[PDB]
Structure 1
Amino acid sequence: MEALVLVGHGSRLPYSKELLVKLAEKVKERNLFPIVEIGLMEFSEPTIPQAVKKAIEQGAKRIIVVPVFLAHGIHTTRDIPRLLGLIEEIPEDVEIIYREPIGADDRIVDIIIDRAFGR
């Protein structure tokens, strides 16, 4: 009924996609969502429209799109809401729910501190 679509930037290097794939596996391992797909904005497959359609084709009416980006910017406020046709292929009786990016979350400061000490 509900699907989780994780959306990342994409790069010409492979690390960005690898990251999204790992993240999606980890959310799969938590068994919270019936359906979990990934999409990359640029340079990589699957693309955002691809991931969105793949979620509909598995029988999702409500698509939760989380932008796995640190902050808001051009990507999260123009490009992505575009590719989701939220500002200008979605069946009329399906809603895209566009969520918020990671932000300055306390857990991010925990991670930064670990990273500072090579952990």
Structure 2
Amino acid sequence: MEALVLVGHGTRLPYSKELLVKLAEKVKERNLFPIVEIGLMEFSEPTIPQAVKKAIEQGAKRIIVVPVFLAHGIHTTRDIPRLLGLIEDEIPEDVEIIYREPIGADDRIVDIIIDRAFGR
């Protein structure tokens, strides 16, 4: 009934898509959602529309889209919302898209940054 779709930038290099895959893999083993799908905005498949369609196919009526970006930007305020038909200018059913918020300057980002400083 619920689907989590992780969505990321995507690059020509593969590292952007490896991350999303890894993250999706880690959320799967937490057994929080029935369906979990990734979608990359550019250069790589699956594409955001592809992910959403796949989630619908597996029977989800709540599609939670989470933007895996540190900071808001044009990609999150325009590009992705369009792709999701949340903004004027992929057509869903009676299903509902719930577009969530980016990572932002979470306390946990500070935690991670500190470890990185020390090579952990």
Q: TM-score, normalised by structure 2?
A: 0.97
Q: Deviations over 1:36-72 (max 9, x none)?
A: 0000000000000000000000000110000000010
Aligned equivalents of 2:63, 2:79: Cα separation in 1: 18
Deviations 1:67-114 (A, max 9, x none): 000010100000000111111233441110000000000000000000
Shift of 1:21: 0.2
3-state DSSP class of the match of 2:58? coil
1:84/1:91 CA distance change after superposition, 3 Å: closer
Separation in structure 1 between the aligned mates of residue 33 and residue 74 of structure 2, nearest angstrom: 29
- Structure 1 length normalisation: TM-score? 0.98
Q: What does residue range 21-100 of structure 1 map to in structure 2 within 5 Å?
A: 21-88=21-88, 89-100=90-101
Gaps of 5+ in 1: none
Q: What is the RMSD computed on CA atoms of the aligned residues? A: 0.7
The whole-number CA distance in structure 2 between the counterparts of 1:78 and 1:91 is: 18
Matches within 5 A, 1:2-21: 2-21=2-21
* Separation in structure 1 between the aligned mates of residue 118 and residue 92 of structure 2, nearest angstrom: 49
Change over 3 Å in CA distance of 1:8–1:91 after alignment to 2: closer
* CA displacement, residues 15-34 of structure 1 (integer Å, 9 cap, x when unaligned): 00000000000000100000
